[PDB]
Write a protein that binds this ligand. Structure first.
Ligand SMILES: CC(C)(C)OC(=O)N[C@@H](C(=O)NO)c1ccc(Br)cc1
Ligand SMILES: CC(C)(C)OC(=O)N[C@@H](C(=O)NO)c1ccc(Br)cc1
Ligand SMILES: CC(C)(C)OC(=O)N[C@@H](C(=O)NO)c1ccc(Br)cc1
Ligand SMILES: [Zn+2]
Ligand SMILES: [Zn+2]
Ligand SMILES: [Zn+2]
Ligand SMILES: [Zn+2]
Ligand SMILES: [Zn+2]
Ligand SMILES: [Zn+2]
Lengths: 516, 519, 513
């Protein structure tokens, strides 16, 4: 619980903002079928034109104001375009002779907007929200969206609108979030239930983002495990933090070896949510929790190794904890979930484990270490045997495991591997409804022979096959004996290089998996 | 003084320093050339040139008070030799008293005004004549034109190159070393040049002292032993001194400086030396030196080709330059001036305790900094040092540092770069460069690159991820930690080490001293 | 004249747009004291705020329209801030019930805007123009700018507004520009000069942006001829046969491995009347630099960008446009470029080759990727024989510039301080930033060849830019000479296009001399 320090100026906890300005936004959903009121703040119409390429803007909605409706008549609007991401602002006086601000955002010419399409619309919308001191925003849906896409709109809106200023000291003086958000859409009553779900999904994602973005001197195994406890306490999760003494008794030799060279003791996070009624499904969610990945003696010194980004290497853990918030808040029924993460730090030291070392996992398997920079699968290995010992139905691990993902699926799609096709399908189904894209990749058994060690039971890495993501999955597969298991590699999708911030990828995905 | 920690008992606990050098035992005499030259014992060398006559014949113009020697040096005899820069010859003959004497010359080219580099070549050629000859006396006859500043440069360079560092020699000591005991100089209007002699001797040792600190390996020269050397120096010079330990640095919240040293076995030591004039103080100056006793690069380890990790003892050259300046100032004792000699000394190592890439740290002025590269640790330590410097309420802040390797690609190994926020201060540094003959060139602080230091989470980035103009970006960083004081920054990463001669130059000592003295 | 082809689909000329939509824009300048009228198009206020948080926007100028004045009231504008580059624009109806667009661009908190700052202002302004079907743009200057910066504003505006679609197959611009500024009469003379400076820069941009299959030594020399003919300049293109007779072995060696014959461009401008200054402007004209057998294969060598390596030539030709159009007095200008291509072939020159320059000096080649200085050597020998007063060469010579001054400031080297100062003065008034770097003679000894008269490159001295300058200096014996290294500033990496750097710089140099 106590964070060790080298000097007194080293931080001893991760700063966390629980009550965000987003939570102070009062959200109202009205049916468009009744007309729109255009009074205070900024009013934005989401408009398209199906199959007209860059077509003219047409406002279909009834506006309960003669002046505003006159301004928005077709003859006036035809000079404007519906190009995806395009936005404009209008100034006018209403019927009550008050000054009002109105505008629109183009949603293209395709009837069914994709996640990327919706993201671009929101990003354009957020641009209108920044550098304008508005008190209220009104969004009018003149496009077709189902409830899942509507929820995604809000989640993305909240997430992109929110700005992390925890580490700013000498800060934007003009930041001023809206206090009211009005939404006009048809059949408002079906969409109202998605509002609070979006708000929960937002913070779950933003919470994971805060943990990832937090630098390694702030976010260490002790401080992160402490944060998990604080989170568990607020949400009523049973919690248990395993220290070195417990881990040694449990013989987690693979996991403990990675943390040897660190000044922070290893901390194993175990949170549990149990429904009050009959439990029909038991699920273990495992997250990779490397607070910093230096590579060990296989130091990240090669070009393109992105060593300065390696605080992100606990993204899997953050996603699991972010999911814990959503589950703890929405309180699903007939399910018991274990939230696991073997947290440690991979550093260079006189105490560090060396390339060539043979270590023993808690399942008795001896492992020959060929590369200390492949430490993720080592910690995940012991975490998986622990998971299976819990007697669950599904084991789902999520991790920034291999850089090869950047070459396979890139920065938008995560890879999923597994030993069970139905479980994979459930993950794929969750991906669609959560709108966090995942693609099914194969575990090619032909590469297994490349993990055959001369002295230990198995090699940590291959010295042949360059398909590291598959090889790593083959390694993890050896530590799940008789349980449905899936592995999501998020090394490529976790960090937003363009926006220079985390995505909090996986939070909404894991929650949809649990809920449905 | 603090106790130097050891891993084994064989680890050195102090930097060996030679204060009394053979140069200090040399008696220097300056004569007027119009009185004629006496050629008796030891070696007598004529410095000769030939104006616009590309390798011209040698001609001795000076009167020699010896019939035999004057006949030997007559034009007819000397025309077989030429004045090519760096050329030297030895002559053997008998004088009027039937004694054997040794005479020679060094070619000074065909250009009337010799540059520092040219003069250096002349001196180097001269030193070769001193080497491997057991001489007791050297006599140098100036048949060329040099001003007082260039004349002093000759003596300083002569003393520096003649001197040999044998502190770390044990079984391979040179059995044949035997320095001259007397140095004679014949020059026109000598009375004007006499004041430069002792000044040269002072400037020499300041440079040689800095050289000794730099050349000292990192196991000998650590933050503790270097700060101890600073204290010992201050005591000898009657300067006020103050060494800040970790506890005091924490109270001052010097987080950037402390973060770099976290991974070291040697505690951070902040050097603060003070020279105060006895009279009314009219100018207050802070001299800040980068003091990284060893730069491994941190977790951004120097593992790339050309990173020169074996040279990284040099990375405290700025501190050494500052301490060498403290010697000169404390010795010549300029008045009506108050000088602060500062250096945030530490070591950048790889450890479980080391600071990581991506860490956000807080400087003593409250600015939060995101670390993108641990091998850019110099600017982190300088940041807190500059904030400390400005709190002293000085008129000028001048920092000197082996900051960026880009200097090797911009100005190279001969000229140092100077950046600043004040043009008058910059001109003064340039003025000091001319009179000290330590080359400096003005480089710009381009404000357009500033936006690349905008961090998403912290107040500022330590490094840029685009620009690649490392020296300018670093200056932009440091500028953020000097709020309202005239400040200049001298990057000596390229000029500090003499790669051809395999030794330090002690660059900056004479430059900084000239700056203080002529102010 | 005839461009050789490998296949019939290979282009045989560089497409050039001479008449741009920018030339069709009518520009009117009014005095701010008379008030602003808001009728057609888009109206943008350029505003600042000394000591700005960044602080709120406040419009001081009087607007002769009740509807617009209601919009521009302090209470409404306080919601916006003046942070540099920030902009907002709204659409509304004026007193005459016409649709109008009104807005602002934030100019920060500094009273005196820099070259870099003004560019950020312009880009934000241009961003609104690319996404609004406007007929007229009106700019209201509520900031202080001198005559030079105002001209710079227009040049940058015109240049960034213009879009190159020459190579877009398939698989709008405003017609009026209104300017409100204090002391309007003083700024009116700057308008047409800016339009000239614009195209000079944009013309150079077109040559640089043109790919190596379009822009080759033959097609580039042809383009120079066509330009000279339109400007009524005397022109002369030296071919291989003439070059051999002139014994330009260094220049000819670089082009040996190319399928395109070497072409030496020589344009000349003579002022009507007494000539008081004679100047030769030399531009590096490598249409493509593969590096030769010292192939650009190392990481970060950016071989896909190497069409840019004739930027120096383009800058000189762009200058030829400006000088030929504005027609300065008392001056004679020579526009020179030894154009060729550096390729890998059985006919290519090899590392280790010893070649003879036209001045008789033998050169040992240590790196075929340092071909720029070799071509410049013969060009400099050619230039001095013309008997000029100043020789100024401009070249993308060394990548080391990216490590010294970066992408914003070019480096200038020289043997004459008066010439250097004139360049620096020209840099200030043209707002194309240049910084004086030294030619350190101590490094000269590293060019001493064991067998030849001189080495092409150094064997260490990582100060490549200075060493190269030391090389070129050996080919100017008795003339005031300057060298501008634009390797770092030539290409705009963020915008993915050329800057046309040097055109305005060279013209100001000629004009103010
Ligand atoms: C097997 C091999 C030797 C290639 O090592 C890696 O697979 N490195 C990954 C790692 O260091 N895991 O801990 C990694 C690299 C980049 C990114 Br982004 C993520 C993960
Ligand atoms: C910003 C960057 C990542 C390039 O890091 C450097 O600037 N390196 C310098 C350094 O390590 N300072 O601490 C340095 C290298 C070599 C020489 Br020689 C001098 C100084
Ligand atoms: C050090 C060396 C002698 C090889 O010189 C180069 O660095 N090459 C330049 C070149 O290829 N001249 O022809 C160059 C490279 C990149 C850029 Br950008 C500009 C110029
Ligand atoms: Zn790793
Ligand atoms: Zn990892
Ligand atoms: Zn370093
Ligand atoms: Zn350093
Ligand atoms: Zn080249
Ligand atoms: Zn080139």
């Amino acid at each position: 619980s106590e964070v060790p320090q080298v000097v007194s100026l080293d931080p001893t906890s991760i700063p966390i903002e629980y009550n965000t300005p987003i939570h102070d936004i009062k959200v109202q959903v009205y049916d468009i079928k009744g007309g729109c009121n255009v009074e205070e703040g900024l009013t934005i119409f989401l408009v398209n034109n199906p199959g007209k390429e860059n077509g003219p803007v047409k406002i279909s909605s009834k506006v309960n104001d003669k002046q505003v409706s006159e301004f928005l008549k077709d003859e006036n609007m035809e000079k404007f375009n519906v190009k995806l991401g395009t936005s404009k602002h209008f100034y006018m006086f209403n019927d009550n002779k008050n000054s009002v601000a109105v505008g629109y955002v183009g949603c293209g010419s395709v009837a069914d907007l994709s996640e990327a399409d919706m993201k671009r619309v929101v990003l354009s919308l957020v641009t209108m929200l920044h550098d304008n001191k508005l008190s209220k925003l009104t969004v009018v849906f003149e496009i077709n969206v189902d409830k899942n896409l509507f929820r995604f709109f809000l989640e993305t809106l909240f997430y992109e609108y929110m700005t992390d200023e925890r580490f700013k000291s000498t800060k934007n003086v003009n930041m001023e979030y809206i206090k009211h958000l009005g939404v006009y859409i048809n059949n408002a009553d079906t969409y109202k239930e998605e509002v609070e779900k979006a708000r929960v999904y937002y913070f779950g994602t933003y919470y994971a983002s805060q943990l990832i973005a937090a630098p390694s001197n702030y976010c260490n195994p002790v401080s992160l495990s402490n944060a998990a406890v604080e989170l568990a306490q607020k949400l009523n999760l049973e919690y248990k933090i395993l220290g070195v003494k417990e881990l040694e008794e449990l013989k987690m030799g693979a996991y403990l070896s990675v943390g040897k060279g660190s000044m922070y003791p290893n901390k194993f996070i175990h949170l549990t949510y149990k429904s009050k009624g009959d439990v029909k499904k038991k699920i273990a969610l495992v997250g990779k929790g490397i607070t910093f990945d230096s590579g060990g003696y296989n130091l990240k010194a090669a070009p393109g190794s992105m060593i300065d980004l390696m605080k992100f290497d606990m993204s899997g853990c953050a996603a699991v904890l972010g999911c814990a918030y959503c589950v703890g808040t929405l309180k699903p029924e007939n399910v018991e979930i274990h939230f696991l993460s073997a947290v440690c730090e991979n550093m260079v030291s006189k105490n560090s484990y060396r390339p060539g070392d043979i270590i023993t996992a808690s399942n008795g398997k001896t492992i020959e270490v060929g590369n200390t920079d492949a430490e993720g699968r080592l910690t995940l290995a012991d975490a998986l045997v622990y998971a299976e010992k819990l007697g669950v139905d599904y084991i789902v691990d999520i991790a920034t495991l291999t850089g090869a993902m950047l070459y396979s699926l890139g920065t938008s799609y995560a890879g999923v591997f597994g030993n069970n096709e139905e479980l994979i399908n459930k993950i794929l189904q969750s991906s669609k409804t959560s709108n966090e894209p995942v693609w099914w990749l194969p575990i090619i058994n032909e590469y297994r022979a490349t993990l055959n060690s001369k002295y230990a039971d198995i090699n940590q890495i291959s010295s042949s096959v360059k398909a590291s993501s598959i090889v790593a999955s083959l390694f993890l597969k050896e530590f799940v004996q008789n349980t449905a298991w899936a592995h999501i590699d998020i090394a490529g999708v976790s960090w937003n290089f363009k926006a220079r911030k985390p995505k909090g990828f996986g939070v909404r995905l894991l929650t949809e998996f649990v809920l449905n």
